[PDB]
């Protein structure tokens, strides 16, 4: 069916909770055997939110090349995006270490660093220019160039430097700040106005590294950043945009990475956020 009355029909029908059961019956299990070893229980926010072994990022390193992240690469849409958690207080430097060694251009954050009262990841990058942060385990150095702060979100402008060759790169940090601690946002106009902010600054191209894009546990807000940014570009690409159907992209997405869409309300607020989208596109 189309999407927006396939949208419609489930709302009168009031099935969502059905429709999501189906796609977590229908997903793909593959092992995550590294990620259990018992050496990476602190490189591990959840015990079930787990990277997949067959699409794991690994670290340019022969002591422990593990990290919680996740390549999800889309080949019809010719997009690929790395997801992972929220940075641990034991795995910062990891975090920036997988960054450089990807070549990524733009981090993507949709959390807060505090919400419902708890720790949802560590402060990651430098709040002011003059107090540098310096990851010794990995050997890299992180400076605050600027800041703009929004209404919905807030864009920096970071330079990671490589000590150990003294290279120097500019990552752009892409930080929704307004996602509310329960439930989905209302409309998803502000959401859909910071994706296109993303794309805007070629965070998203083929000439950089893929985009590295994280929440708390890395499925949810994530899974739904990455679903409409790849349901709107099929829609550009193909001859008959009604053919795309998100429950099929979806699921060709958790074969990258398990989980992807937590709730019944975060595949609703997907679905929204495609419908509205292609109409502003064109
Ligand atoms: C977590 S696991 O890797 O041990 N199991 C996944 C699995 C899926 C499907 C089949 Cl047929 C077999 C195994």
């Known amino acids: 069916m189309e999407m927006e009355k396939e949208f419609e029909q489930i709302d009168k029908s009031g099935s969502w909770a059905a429709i999501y059961q189906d796609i977590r019956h229908e997903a793909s299990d593959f092992p ?5 070893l018992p050496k990476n229980k602190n490189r591990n926010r959840y015990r079930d939110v787990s990277p997949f072994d067959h699409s794991r990022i690994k670290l340019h390193q022969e002591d422990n090349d593990y990290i919680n992240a996740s390549l999800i690469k889309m080949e019809e849409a010719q997009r690929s995006y790395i997801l992972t958690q929220g940075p641990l207080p034991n795995t910062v430097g990891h975090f920036w270490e997988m960054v ?28 002011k220019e003059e107090k540098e942060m310096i990851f010794e385990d990995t050997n890299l150095k ?7 702060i929004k209404s919905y979100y807030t864009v920096r402008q970071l ?25 989905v946002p209302e409309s998803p106009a502000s959401f859909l106005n910071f994706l296109f902010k993303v794309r805007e600054s070629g965070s998203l191209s083929p000439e950089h590294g893929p985009v590295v894009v994280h929440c708390s546990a890395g499925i949810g807000r994530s899974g739904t950043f990455c679903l409409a940014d790849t349901c709107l570009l099929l829609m550009d690409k193909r001859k008959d945009p009604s053919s795309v159907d998100i429950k099929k992209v979806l699921l060709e997405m958790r074969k990258f990475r398990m989980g992807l869409i937590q709730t019944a309300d975060q595949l609703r607020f997907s679905y929204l956020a495609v419908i509205e989208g292609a109409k502003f596109i064109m």
């Open 32 to 36: 995550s055997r590294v990620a259990k």
């Open 142 to 148: 992180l400076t605050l160039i600027s800041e703009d």
């Open 159 to 183: 330079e990671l430097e490589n000590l150990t060759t003294q290279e120097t790169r500019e990552i752009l940090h892409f930080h929704y700040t307004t996602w509310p601690d329960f439930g």
């Open 100 to 127: 450089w060694e990807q070549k990524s251009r733009g981090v993507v954050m949709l959390n807060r660093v505090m919400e419902k009262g708890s720790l949802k990841c560590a402060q990651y990058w430098p709040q």
